[PDB]
Ligand binder design. Structure first.
Ligand SMILES: CSc1nc(C(F)(F)F)cc(=O)n1C
Ligand SMILES: CSc1nc(C(F)(F)F)cc(=O)n1C
Ligand SMILES: [Cl-]
Ligand SMILES: [Mg+2]
Ligand SMILES: [Mg+2]
Ligand SMILES: [Mg+2]
Ligand SMILES: [Mg+2]
Lengths: 194, 194
């Protein structure tokens, strides 16, 4: 029975805006919320994609391909799934394969594509598709993969065995100042709990 | 190689602020980033999210989730039980408290993540992911009494761990909900561990 009554702009940047949201609570009382949104969403089913890249090689354990980047909002290096915003007119699947090749150099194959999932729904309206992609690491195209970083993109590739992912993330967190992304950590936890 | 030079306040609300981050890019070039932060961090992290494993003998193991209207999203979301850590509260104690308030369940800590980032391209927000087991056969968890704070309105949805991804896909298909990216990520890995 809850719904939005109004969205009032508080502050609009080039990339991010702050809104005062007025909504109806389930007792029938109007309340407000401070809401973050991006300015970059057009007709896309979501802001962005994140790629779960499963690197497959004969006589290797499967790896999960991760990226390490400086994230200004965090003031530090973060370990994440490869990810980027969806270009206007682009499918989530094309954005996923394109961002994976740009950030890691790998040419993947689509396996599955999530519905739009919320990044931090108490804070923002931001959504992604989580796109699972396999990388045939036996293909010559995926032998010596070179990232194609865009202007101001600076990405390090970290491939960790699926069968030990959580302990290998713990060992990287123990060795330096860096944050693991919550989606990566949730995925590594589930691999342990299965 | 990369670091924060300065931060410029653009807009402060009660709960969230918008900053302009100046940072040194690895080439020796200074760059700007629009960054969101909470105003509420004093703590290991802003928040906890609880992975609650409901264990009842002769039943499938369930993951306990919550459905809430999220004003930034303009709709209903399915999430791990979660809230901000009170000043002076440990992440573990915040986890058991949030789980009790949102679900009525009384659980035991299994493990606690380090601080992990929610959306590091947009925000500095971090959480501890806290794995909790719930002895569902215990009297105290027979008729679980959820204690919602002012303006909290939370539905409990328990889904079998062994079919979690298909069950979440079903809810999105029929109920027009948004699944949280950490919940979806956990559900994917449970399928991918095979
Ligand atoms: C933790 S309560 C709250 N948090 C936020 C935000 F997440 F954006 F920081 C905005 C808001 O309006 N409230 C009531
Ligand atoms: C996707 S590029 C970008 N995104 C953001 C934000 F994520 F906050 F929306 C801010 C910013 O300055 N840039 C360059
Ligand atoms: Cl467990
Ligand atoms: Mg990216
Ligand atoms: Mg990119
Ligand atoms: Mg909550
Ligand atoms: Mg709460």
């Amino acid at each position: 029975k809850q719904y939005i009554i109004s969205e009032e702009l508080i502050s609009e940047g080039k990339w991010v805006k702050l809104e005062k949201t007025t909504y109806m609570d389930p007792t029938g009382k109007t309340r407000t919320w401070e809401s973050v949104k991006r300015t970059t969403r057009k007709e896309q089913t979501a802001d962005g994609v994140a790629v779960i890249p499963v690197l497959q090689r004969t006589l290797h354990y499967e790896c999960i391909v991760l990226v390490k980047q400086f994230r200004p909002p965090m003031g530090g290096y973060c370990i994440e799934f490869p990810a980027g915003l969806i270009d206007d007119g682009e499918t989530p699947e094309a954005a996923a394969l394109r961002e994976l090749e740009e950030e890691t150099g790998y040419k993947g194959d689509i396996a599955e594509c999530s519905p739009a999932v919320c990044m931090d729904p108490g804070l923002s309206n931001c959504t992604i598709h989580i796109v699972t992609v396999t990388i045939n690491g036996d293909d010559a195209e995926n032998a010596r993969p070179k990232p194609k970083p865009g202007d101001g993109e600076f990405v390090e590739v970290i491939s960790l065995p699926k069968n030990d992912l959580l302990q290998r993330l713990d060992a990287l967190v123990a060795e330096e100042h860096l944050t693991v992304d919550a989606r990566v950590y949730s995925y590594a936890l589930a691999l342990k709990h299965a």
